[PDB]
């Protein structure tokens, strides 16, 4: 698995691959690893899909529940602290092999610099939370490769279109060196998914845009 997070002028984004493996065997080709957690935040998860998907689901519910009860949404930092609490509550399972690690992004409504309201927070298996502020970050088995690719192709304060392209490319490089990530499948028309968050909120990138971006990277590479 590989999930990447990138910061840009407007806001932040999250993109993840679609593969699931059980050892060497491929178990899924269309896993959704990125979820909109609320109006201005999204999260990607790596690890035991069983636990991960329902955990991020509960997170989303918890955020909306807070807002309905208090009449006010939580601070971005507050949302991050809550995710930490949930990760911490899974330490037991993690110590038995059922670990999960999320990657959180969001457009901070309480941010001063509105062009830099995009934030990236990574987590520990013990519940620790960390501000990234390098422009990008990644999690999962292929994260090492994705980060090293981004270290070269990423441009700070770029526009959304540029950030989205660098993201799909870093994921491409990840699937290129990590059999557990899996790249674009032009055969079945299945591509990485993504979410972008800006002043206007969190939106799901259309599969037409992902398809387009994938075809492009493939063509650039196929061209030797």
């Amino acid at each position: 698995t590989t999930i990447v997070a990138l910061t840009y002028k407007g806001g932040v984004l999250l993109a993840g691959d679609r593969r699931a493996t059980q050892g060497n065997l491929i178990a899924s080709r269309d896993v959704e690893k990125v979820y909109v957690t609320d109006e201005y935040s999204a999260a990607g998860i790596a690890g035991t899909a069983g636990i991960a998907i329902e955990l991020v689901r509960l997170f989303a519910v918890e955020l909306e529940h807070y807002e309905k009860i208090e009449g006010v949404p939580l601070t971005f930092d507050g949302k991050a602290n809550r995710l930490a609490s949930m990760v911490r509550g899974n330490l037991g399972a993690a110590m038995q092999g059922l670990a999960v690690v999320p990657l959180l992004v969001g457009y901070d409504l309480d941010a001063d610099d509105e062009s830099r309201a995009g934030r990236i927070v990574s987590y520990d298996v013990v519940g620790g939370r960390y501000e990234e502020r390098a422009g990008y970050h990644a999690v999962g088995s292929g994260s090492l490769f994705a980060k090293s690719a981004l270290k070269k192709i990423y441009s700070p304060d770029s526009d959304e279109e540029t950030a989205l392209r660098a993201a799909i490319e870093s994921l491409y490089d990840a699937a290129d060196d990590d059999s557990a990530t899996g790249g674009p499948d032009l055969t079945r028309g299945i591509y990485p998914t993504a979410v972008t968050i800006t002043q206007a909120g969190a939106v799901h990138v259309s599969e037409e845009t992902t398809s387009e971006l994938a075809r492009r990277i493939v063509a650039e590479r196929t061209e030797q």
Binding site: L58, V61, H65, K68, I69
Partner: peptide, 13 residues
Amino acid sequence: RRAGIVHADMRGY
């Protein structure tokens, strides 16, 4: 009102 929200959110989950 709060109990109702708790109840609804929980059932949905």
